[PDB]
Design a protein around this nucleic acid. Structure first.
Ligand SMILES: [Mg+2]
Ligand SMILES: [Mg+2]
Ligand SMILES: [Mg+2]
Ligand SMILES: [Mg+2]
Ligand SMILES: [Mg+2]
Ligand SMILES: [Mg+2]
Ligand SMILES: [Mg+2]
Ligand SMILES: [Mg+2]
Ligand SMILES: [Mg+2]
Ligand SMILES: [Mg+2]
Ligand SMILES: [Mg+2]
Lengths: 199, 190, 247, 138, 176, 109
RNA sequence: GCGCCGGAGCCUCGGUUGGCCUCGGAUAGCCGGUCCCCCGCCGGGGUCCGGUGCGGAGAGCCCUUCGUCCCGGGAAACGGGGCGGCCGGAAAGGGGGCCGCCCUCUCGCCCGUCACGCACCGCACGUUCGUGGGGAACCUGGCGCUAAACCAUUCGUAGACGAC
RNA sequence: GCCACUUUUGGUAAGCAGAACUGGCGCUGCGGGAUGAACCGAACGCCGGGUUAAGGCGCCCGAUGCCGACGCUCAUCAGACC
RNA sequence: GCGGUGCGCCGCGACCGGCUCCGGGACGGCUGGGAAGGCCCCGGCGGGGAAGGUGGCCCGGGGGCCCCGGGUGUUACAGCC
């Protein structure tokens, strides 16, 4: 009863638009690997937009001003907060439901992370428009932890490769087993084929 | 308009054998192997003929600024096959007015120390990007010969040393000093 | 309207929360970045200020007007007894920073260092690490320790060794010793923990850490001067004599 | 590299629209994005059809680009498409989708009671193959 | 006029009133294009006011009917002569479309003028729509379809039906 | 011995931008997302089930803490399969984004 | 008087009504095998063979709850349930796999046979996660523990007072 | 007294001053124009059901989560509704 | 038993009427007494036309008789008007 969304290949505010309404309707949504979120438009326009957000600062005491978060997780958290009614109790309950991480931490490396096709770069951009990675933008604007995230990601992609070879060889044992037992399951198989489950 | 189809082919000689792995192309031949990754250009690359003699690049439904890119792949692959089967050689001449420009070549072709340019004491160390070898020529007074496979690496390493020898704060039209690219061309003639 | 005569700004905004320091001894905000091609060495030490003195030395800088002449120079004597190493701390690099992994203390911790764990050494019964130092003289405790050393060898990235001053040898009033994490910079993590657990529980002098004529950085809180005003603190220009509510 | 091409005389399964679920034969190309089309042996009347609703398949039957519905019907049932489609593994999984959508309550129960043992037998055969691989290893 | 929906072609005829100097006037006829016969009769009196000395009151409609397309199953080329008013000065034009029906190509004409030139349907003034054979065409965007062996793939099939699987785990495919 | 109610979420009241009308709940039912598809649920008894502090009765049983506010599903809403319900006492805004059960039993099948 | 494991019930806060245990990723390209072939610490790739509106399908997969009783068929047998060791986990560490024992069953599953179980007399919050989270007192045992903080005094590296 | 369509006088001009016609505000809520005396819609007893106007329908925020239709458009200062 | 009135509280159903938002059938009129299309050229007889030119013919190359281009031209072993 928790939506584990992936973040790679998704447009920033176009993912945040679905996430905002889906959290106001009561889900607990965990958008994971947020540094792989990309934004449309080219990287120099996008970092000029974020540097303009940096210079927008309370003049007399910038401690009270806009907290320009630098990590990609909290950039995406700030844009979901912009799309939620967060001055009030239901918007604050929604922000309490949304959890947002950089990379894939170990409550969620073992779980199967979802996608949103409606907010995805190969669906909602022309293939010749330039885009901009939010992780690289965050690193250019002052996020400190790109390199440690990338090394932890190559570690988890190795360990996921191990899990995937194990799952492949289990699936191949399953197909050799079904080939070896079709003589005494082909009566059970045949009524799953007449109801459209194996054709 | 959105033009329905535009294509060009690339004739391929016999001593070489291109192979395309999806959209990145890998040219192997006499001198060395080199690749280039066309995954930014959104076209189709057929490899046709047996002996694989032709590379067809075609683009379907392309407007003007994208049909511009349908023969620039042909130009990159033509320059690619040229640099594989023949290699590239840029000879660049060292022009001075009074102070002679002293060039020494360290790390067997990979770093260039330029000295005495305009009488400056700041010595210039320029590193060739990999695969390019700089060399002082013979039977000619002031040359630097840049050998390599592909022109982007070779001509980039040439432009680095040309912009390294530059005149600042004075009249660039009178003070015609520096090392300038004179003779682009080939290692082995065909 | 603007300011008639431009003039640079009093004070620095870089040091801006000009409050009392939240800690008495100066903390190293950043140790030097390690490279594994060094031998293993300590990147900090901890001495106490004593005073000031002249010297006379013959300066060798060629070209200068004081070449081969003899300047005098103010020096500062930092009395610096050998610190005793007591524990090691390991750190794992996380996408939220660098968290601590597993602090490991030695068996015999001297009462110099034991006073640091107590706000009141008189009223207590001096009970710190009594349940902990039974983990060194039994087999289950020793191989639990070898388990966490093996976990520190493979999950930690930065290793900081714990060291305290040796306060008996100092003429001060106090006895409660200063404890400090010193980062061990040097070779790979196996070499680093082997060095650290071999030199665990024993001393290290200054000459293991620094050398003669080595530029260092000095960290500490300044000399406190109390609640003071803008002329005394920010060095603004005093308003003239005729001012009604104070100048 | 592309292997399904819009041209004169391909059949295309239709995704949505008025005529969802049928094959058509593309006759001519009106625009960048619209095509004159006719499925004459499946009751799709000769009409225009956009490309966005039609999924072109690997059946090229030849006829001229202005041929009438008579000649498209002739080439259709000369090639005998309507059995090649019903034997194609596209339409087999289409009609399988349609079957498990058409499934009633009682046979949903019968499917469940079947597939429970149909998974039990594979599951213990798979674990005995796992221990047979471990005995091969040992 | 609002170019609402696909247009229809209206053959509409009209004449001045029976007046005692000429008791039977001539009858005039227009091919006009309009969403329905009400706005069609209004466009008729607009153009006949532009051409003759004839108005809503000094004349009458006679037959306002539809021209059905006479071969809607043969793809044809249409040449369309226009007259539109820009932000600065009006211009005569010639555009070419390719469609099954005549009113379909004029619907495509109004939408193409509104797309490219921002010309709105009160400003756009039609004058001549003709079916043009496949060699008299002047425009490359139409002439590129004159191929008996025309052939092209459908390269980048961008995923429509985005929100039926809204939280999926498949990455979508676009090579079909 | 399992669930006999469809899952629905009290999205909000029937409202405008500067006005809400609390007599009509907006219910978002799981799985149905079009007006072509919302037709099955019209007229179904829906219920907001909640617990409380002190015990109240429970018919066909003994008193416990749980409580209801019954209703019915009146008419579709929008194009995304959102629907309107009317409850016999208006729902508290406590219930925003909490599970309203929507039953099956006024069947028309 | 406090932590730990080894039963009855009582207040209070409430949400919830089966799980999905994971390749990386491409998008003018993918997925899965054999490896016949070549090297590296099983993997990397060429080659061939299948799928590709994805069926090794999230349009999906697993689980499938009325219960027991007789006996029969298919299924299992090398299986189910019930004590000690081996390791696998660090980014915010997994109620996981594996070697034996002494126990005990042909019961679990799929088709049939046989009857029985308040059939509470048409009627709503049922069915769970649930030994839920927190709070007091009744508990019967066992191995473990019997500390600091603050004031007051002093210091003066600190100081308006606290603070240090 | 003030504002607005259109006509109009002085003034370079003005959220300036001075007129004509009509409608408004003042005396007036309500939906929309984010915000707002005058603009767009619409004028009011207290309610239930239905339906609209002007304006909208990614999310804040009811409504496009249409497999909407045809194009133009790259902005290192994009554009976005009397 | 009949007639009136009400149930202590919480609920359900049934039909009848009013007002509505929908959904499924079915029948007919008008038009250019609809425009097209369907089946009986490879609808019938004969006459033409040209191309987004099919056969064939030639030229060119990719092959193992097919495909790909370019030219000629008028039904041929496709069709269109
Ligand atoms: Mg000068
Ligand atoms: Mg100034
Ligand atoms: Mg005075
Ligand atoms: Mg409950
Ligand atoms: Mg005025
Ligand atoms: Mg009035
Ligand atoms: Mg008013
Ligand atoms: Mg505004
Ligand atoms: Mg008006
Ligand atoms: Mg109302
Ligand atoms: Mg709005």
């Amino acid at each position: 009863q928790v939506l584990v969304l992936d973040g790679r290949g998704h447009l920033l505010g176009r993912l945040a638009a679905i996430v905002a309404k889906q959290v106001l309707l009561g889900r607990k949504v965990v958008v994971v690997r947020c540094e792989g979120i990309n934004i449309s438009g080219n990287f120099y326009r996008n970092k000029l937009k974020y540097l303009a957000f940096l210079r927008k600062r309370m003049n007399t005491n910038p401690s009270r001003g806009p907290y320009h978060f630098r990590a990609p997780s909290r950039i995406f958290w700030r844009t979901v907060r912009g799309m939620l009614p967060h001055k009030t109790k239901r918007g604050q309950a929604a922000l309490d439901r949304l959890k947002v991480f950089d990379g894939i931490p170990p409550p969620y490396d073992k779980k199967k992370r979802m996608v949103v096709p409606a907010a995805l770069k190969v669906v909602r951009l022309k293939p010749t428009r330039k885009f901009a990675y939010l992780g690289r933008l965050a690193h250019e604007v002052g996020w400190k932890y790109q390199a440690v995230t990338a090394t932890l990601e190559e570690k988890r992609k190795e360990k996921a490769k191990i899990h995937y070879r194990k799952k492949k060889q289990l699936m191949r044992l399953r197909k050799q087993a079904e080939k070896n037992v079709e003589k005494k399951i082909s009566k059970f198989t045949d009524v799953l084929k007449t109801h459209g489950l194996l054709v | 308009m959105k033009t329905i189809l535009s294509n060009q082919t690339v004739d391929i000689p016999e001593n070489v054998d291109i192979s395309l792995k999806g959209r990145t192309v890998i040219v192997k031949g006499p001198r060395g192997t080199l690749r280039r990754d066309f995954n930014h250009i959104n076209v189709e690359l057929s490899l046709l003929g047996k002996k694989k003699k032709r590379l067809r690049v075609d683009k379907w439904w392309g407007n003007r600024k994208e049909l511009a890119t349908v023969r620039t792949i042909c130009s990159h692959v033509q320059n690619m096959i040229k640099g594989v089967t023949l290699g590239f050689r840029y000879k660049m001449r060292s022009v001075y007015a009074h102070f002679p420009i002293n060039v020494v070549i360290q790390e067997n072709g990979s770093l260039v120390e330029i000295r005495n340019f305009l009488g400056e004491k700041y010595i210039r160390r320029v590193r060739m990007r990999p695969g390019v070898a700089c060399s002082v020529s013979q039977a000619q007074k002031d040359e630097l010969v840049l050998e390599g496979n592909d022109i982007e690496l070779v001509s980039n390493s040439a432009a680095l040393i040309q912009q390294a020898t530059t005149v600042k704060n004075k009249d660039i039209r009178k003070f015609l000093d520096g090392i300038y690219v004179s003779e682009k061309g080939t290692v082995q003639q065909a | 309207s603007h300011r008639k005569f431009s003039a640079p700004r009093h004070g620095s905004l870089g040091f801006l929360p000009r409050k009392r320091s939240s800690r008495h001894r100066g903390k190293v905000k950043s140790f030097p970045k390690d490279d594994p091609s060094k031998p293993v060495h300590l990147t900090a030490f901890l001495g106490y200020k004593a005073g000031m003195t002249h010297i006379v030395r013959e300066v060798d800088r060629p070209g200068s007007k004081v070449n081969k002449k003899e300047v005098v120079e103010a020096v500062t004597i930092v009395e610096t007894p050998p610190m005793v190493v007591v524990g090691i701390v390991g750190y794992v690099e996380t996408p939220r920073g660098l968290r601590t992994f597993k602090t490991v203390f030695a068996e015999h911790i001297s009462d110099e260092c034991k006073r640091r764990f107590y706000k009141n050494w008189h009223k207590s019964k001096k009970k710190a690490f009594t349940k902990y130092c039974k983990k060194w003289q039994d087999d289950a405790g020793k191989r639990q320790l070898d388990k966490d050393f093996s976990s520190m060898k493979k999950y930690c990235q930065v290793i900081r060794v714990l060291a305290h001053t040796q306060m008996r040898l100092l003429p001060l009033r106090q006895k409660k010793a200063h404890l400090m994490e010193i980062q061990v910079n040097g070779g790979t993590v196996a070499e680093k923990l082997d060095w650290a657990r071999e030199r665990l529980e024993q001393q290290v002098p200054v000459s293991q850490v620094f050398g003669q004529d080595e530029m260092i950085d000095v960290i500490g809180v300044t000399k406190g001067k109390g609640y003071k005003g803008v002329t005394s603190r920010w060095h603004t220009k005093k308003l003239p004599r005729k001012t009604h509510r104070g100048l | 590299v592309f292997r399904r091409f819009v041209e004169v005389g391909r059949v295309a399964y239709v995704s949505f629209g008025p005529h969802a679920g049928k094959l058509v034969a593309i006759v001519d190309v009106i625009d960048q994005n619209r095509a004159l089309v006719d499925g004459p042996c499946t009751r799709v009347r000769r009409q225009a059809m956009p490309f966005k609703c039609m999924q072109l398949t690997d059946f090229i039957l030849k006829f001229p680009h202005s041929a009438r519905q008579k000649y498209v019907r002739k080439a259709w049932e000369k090639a005998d498409i309507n059995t090649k489609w019903a034997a194609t593994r596209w339409a087999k999984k289409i009609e399988a989708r349609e079957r498990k959508a058409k499934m009633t309550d009682f046979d949903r129960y019968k499917v469940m009671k079947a597939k429970k043992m149909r998974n039990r037998i594979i599951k213990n055969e798979v674990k005995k193959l796992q221990r047979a691989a471990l005995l091969k290893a040992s | 006029m609002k170019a609402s929906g696909t247009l229809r072609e209206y053959k509409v005829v009209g004449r001045c009133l029976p007046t005692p100097k000429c008791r039977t006037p001539p009858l005039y006829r227009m091919r006009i294009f309009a969403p329905n016969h009400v706005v069609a009769k209004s466009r008729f009196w607009y153009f006949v006011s532009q051409l003759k000395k004839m108005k809503k009151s000094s004349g009458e409609i006679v037959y306002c009917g539809q021209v059905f397309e006479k071969s809607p199953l043969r793809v044809k080329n249409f040449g369309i002569w226009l007259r539109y008013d820009s932000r600065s000065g009006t211009h005569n034009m010639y555009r070419e479309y390719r469609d099954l029906t005549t009113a379909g190509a004029v619907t495509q004409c109004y939408r193409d003028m509104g797309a490219r030139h921002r010309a709105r349907a009160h400003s756009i003034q039609i004058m001549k729509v003709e079916e043009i054979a496949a060699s008299k065409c002047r425009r490359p965007a139409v002439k590129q379809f004159h191929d008996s062996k025309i052939k092209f793939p459908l390269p980048h099939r961008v995923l429509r039906r985005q929100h039926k699987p809204r939280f999926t785990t498949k990455r979508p495919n676009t090579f079909f | 011995s399992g669930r006999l109610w469809c899952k629905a979420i009290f999205a909000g009241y029937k409202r405008g931008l500067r006005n809400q009308r609390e007599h009509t709940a907006l219910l978002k039912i799981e799985g149905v997302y079009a007006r072509d598809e919302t037709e099955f649920y019209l007229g179904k008894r829906c219920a907001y089930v909640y617990k409380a502090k002190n015990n109240t009765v429970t018919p066909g049983g003994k008193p416990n803490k749980t409580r209801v506010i019954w209703g019915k599903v009146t008419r579709a809403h929008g194009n995304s399969g959102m629907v309107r319900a009317k409850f016999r006492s208006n729902l508290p805004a406590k219930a925003i984004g909490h599970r309203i059960r929507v039953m099956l039993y006024p069947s028309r099948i």
